[PDB]
Structure 1
């Protein structure tokens, strides 16, 4: 039960967004929710998706995580508007189609560094700024994918960016640990989202989960959200630097 908890959720773009799954779960358990977005188009969808939630107040903030000024000023606004928070759900990644849909060995330097900037660095800076709003401690969760642990066809530059993110989670847990701030990841199975449309062969992946994973079915955004809720609450006290695979057991087999 999360009444009188406030969580910031970053990276809802639409109703299929994994972080909207997180939102519905957290809202149902009584949280106050603050949302951040990048595109105009995404603020519009958030305003519409808010009608399905129980939030009596719309707390929306533009934060493009490529800009230090925007993350710093964003979290500062959030602190002035709603006070201290209890956690952040990070659901942000990006890479070019142009590098994604090409050999990994042909990835461009700007492509590679772009994906690292948005998909991994962004957590470090978010954590630094959110830490300011968690003087009593709290919890930070980022969304990763199995392709950060193993080479997966076509995930390419994004696999390297998730490996980097997963380590970022471990170094931040060590660092922020003494401040009672836990940092973890959920390694989500494949889910039809907007971003999923730029992974070559996504449908083939989806079906192979169905055929092969222990549970013989894919997961959805709400199941990510239910585990998010575990990690962001005191239930997962004593759990930090961890990666939870929410993926039908797929990670455990070969």
Structure 2
């Protein structure tokens, strides 16, 4: 609970307690970190504050930040610079694609749906990194989350797989840009996580079952496993690691 002691991190993408960003936040907090949360819609503002409130210790800052909005993005990190000064990292857990592009054949993806997915799920890392480097005076780490479907074809993942590929290339080109400023850039490729309680029948349940059966560790991924790998990457223990994609997926990525 001291690995991140004295360090401050911005967490993006919390929507509710089931958010992977929230799982990450919990792990960082338990390793001694102070957290700053952003919320996309002032819809989500209520959830983030009450979630942030369940964290004993000093009151976490909670700010608006639409990464699709250049002005709102700059204004957000401007505020962090004013009120907090230096941060030591950003957790970028932002992704979106139109639900109907995750359906049939990728070849029928609309231009708008493609560019929307790229804008929110891929360019947002670069947009955020450009602002974050203004407050990361002591260096640190920028973390993003990806999935195997950005490297290899996963059924129905379609336009999101292409967006995650763009994200993983961005991680590399950002690592090359920002390393000379003392900033590392890394990704965690998380395996599917059981978040719903219903078991038995269902497409996602079939996916999870196949992972339990075939993955090397014979189990699916938890938010806590992802969070604890995030703690490593944000810590000084990872100071030699940048441009890396660490698979936290029970070994599934190694299978042919």
TM-score under structure 2 length normalisation: 0.94
Deviation at 1:58?
Answer: 2.9
Q: Any gaps of 5 or more consecutive residues in structure 2? A: 197-201
Q: Matched residue of 1:40: which SS?
A: coil
Q: 2:248 is matched with which residue?
A: 246
**Does 2:134 align with 1:132?**
yes
SS of the equivalent of 1:101 reads coil
Other-structure match for 2:28: 26
Q: In structure 1, what is the Cα distance between the partners aligned to 2:164 and 2:195?
A: 17
CA distance, structure 2, for counterparts of residue 18 and residue 181 of structure 1: 23
In the TM superposition, structure 1's runs of 4+ consecutive aligned residues that sit over 3 Å from their partners are none
Summarize deviations over 1:33-92 as a string: whole Å, max 9, x none: 000111233221122222332241131111111111111111111111111100000000
2:119 corresponds, among 117, 120, 134, to: 117
Structure 1 spans left out of the alignment, 5+ residues: 195-199
* Residue pair 1:209, 1:250 contacting (<8 A) in 2 also: yes
Per the alignment, residue 161 of structure 2 pairs with 159
Equivalent residue, structure 2, for 1:197: none
Residues 50-59 or 88-97, more deviating: 50-59
**Cα offset, 1:99, TM superposition:** 1.4
- Map of 2:183 onto structure 1: 181
Partner of 2:207: 205
**Match of 1:56, SS?**
coil
TM-score normalized with structure 1 length: 0.95
1:51 aligned partner: 53
Is this contact kept in 2: 1:94–1:119, CA < 8 A? yes
Corresponding residue SS for 1:139: strand
Aligned with 1:86 (options 88, 109, 112): 88
> Contact between 2:12 and 2:37, CA under 8 Å: does it hold in 1?
yes
Q: Say if 2:147 and 2:191, in contact at 8 Å, map to a contact too.
A: yes
> Contact 2:53–2:59 at 8 Å: present in 1 too?
no
2:34–2:60 CA contact under 8 A, matched in 1: no
For residue 160 of structure 1, report the CA deviation from its aligned partner: 0.2
Aligned residues between the structures: 249
Question: CA, structure 1 residues 164+193, in 2 after alignment: closer, same or farther (shift >3 Å)?
Answer: farther
